[PDB]
Design a protein around this ligand. Structure first.
Ligand SMILES: CC(C)Oc1cc(N2CCNCC2)ccc1-c1c(C(N)=O)[nH]c2cc(F)c(F)cc12
Ligand SMILES: [Mn+2]
Ligand SMILES: [Mn+2]
Length: 362
């Protein structure tokens, strides 16, 4: 049985090695009104689904770790805590439950804890004294993986009820996206549906009214093995189609600002360019850092805190060299206008030959 606080790896909770399935859904009907129900009983679709059972089983193990971590996070996340303490407590639990084992099992990307106007990609670097406030709107975005089968799942934390309708707008837009997604469904269609739902909401925060705006340059995406973004984008504002066997992160962002984000603040997130092959490096500090990245993260994203934890120091020039060489890409915090409020909800979905599985669903 799982301990309180959670410390038992998901692997040990399921001795048979069969991890729980997420929410299973029938695919949406076509424009003509033809149902996709036939996929569930098709012997050909069942054969194709069984052939990838090991892959879905890995996503399910990573999803169960994610559910247990986020249930744990919700029980203690409070204003007064430093952003570092929140991230380290969350990551310590995540490492234990995923049974972190080099590139075979672990953390898919750093824990995002972006606040207020900053929509995404903010994690504290060493020495960050930021403390979570009662009026903050915090986006907890973390990932787990088994054999590079990534769970990309996020939720928004608040303490003040004044943001309740903003959170509801974004949860409804995310659930709409999940519902509209399916094999042969256009990505532009999922995007238009998300926008229509989010914009139907009006909110009042400290005597000011706003229509909830989707963040036009933040989007959902396909997921590849050891690849957080596999090249297909799911817009969240108003003709490429989703394909069978694909995995998607369905995420939406709502804002009281412009509904557009720009790079801002100190960068904490970094990730090797997936398309860049072998690059010989002679520069000793740059060479060492790339070897550290290749061994510990490969093509998965990382943060400066994780380099500090690995015992690395005086690596900032080496890291900048890797960025300038195009081997590593920086992913700085993405912010809307000062004074604005942003919220996010995200799930990982499997486009299985038989059904659509919201593998990360709570
Ligand atoms: C800027 C955007 C929000 O995130 C991305 C854009 C890309 N793109 C490449 C192809 N060219 C366009 C950009 C790749 C990956 C991401 C990305 C995502 C995500 N999409 O959820 N989560 C992350 C976490 C990380 F720690 C990280 F380092 C990167 C990411
Ligand atoms: Mn995410
Ligand atoms: Mn994502």
């Amino acid at each position: 049985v799982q301990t309180d606080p959670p410390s038992v790896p998901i692997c040990d909770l399921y001795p048979n090695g069969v991890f729980p399935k997420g929410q299973e859904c029938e695919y949406p009907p076509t424009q003509d009104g033809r149902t996709a129900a036939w996929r569930t009983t098709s012997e050909e679709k069942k054969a194709l689904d069984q052939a990838s059972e090991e892959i879905w089983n890995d996503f399910r193990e990573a999803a169960e770790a994610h559910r247990q971590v986020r249930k744990y996070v919700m029980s203690w996340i409070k204003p007064g805590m430093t952003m570092i303490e929140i991230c380290e407590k969350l990551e310590d639990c995540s490492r234990k439950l995923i049974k972190e084992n080099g590139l075979n099992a672990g953390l898919a990307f750093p824990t995002g804890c972006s606040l207020n106007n900053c929509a995404a990609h903010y994690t504290p670097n060493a020495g960050d004294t930021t403390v979570l406030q009662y009026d903050d709107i915090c986006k907890i975005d973390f990932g787990t993986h088994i054999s590079g089968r990534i769970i990309d799942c996020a939720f928004t934390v608040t303490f003040n009820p004044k943001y309740d309708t903003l959170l509801k707008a974004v949860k409804d837009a995310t659930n709409t996206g999940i519902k509209c997604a399916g094999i042969d469904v256009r990505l532009c269609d999922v995007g238009e549906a998300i926008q229509e739902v989010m914009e139907s909401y009006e909110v009042e925060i400290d005597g000011k009214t706003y229509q909830v705006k989707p963040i036009r340059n933040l989007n959902g995406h396909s997921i590849g093995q050891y690849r957080i973004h596999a090249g297909k984008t799911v817009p969240i504002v108003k003709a490429t189609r989703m394909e069978e066997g694909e995995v998607y992160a369905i995420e939406t962002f709502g804002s009281t600002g412009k509904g557009v984000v720009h790079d801002d603040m100190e960068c904490s997130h970094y990730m090797k360019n997936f398309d860049v092959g072998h690059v010989p490096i002679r520069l000793p500090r740059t060479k060492h850092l790339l070897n550290v990245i290749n061994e510990n993260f490969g093509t998965l994203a990382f943060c400066r805190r994780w380099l500090d934890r690995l015992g690395e120091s005086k690596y900032l020039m080496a890291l900048k060299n890797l960025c300038d060489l195009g081997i590593v890409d920086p992913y700085p915090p993405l912010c809307d206008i000062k004074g604005s409020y942003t919220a996010q909800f995200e799930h990982t979905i499997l486009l299985r030959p038989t059904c659509k599985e919201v593998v990360s669903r709570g």
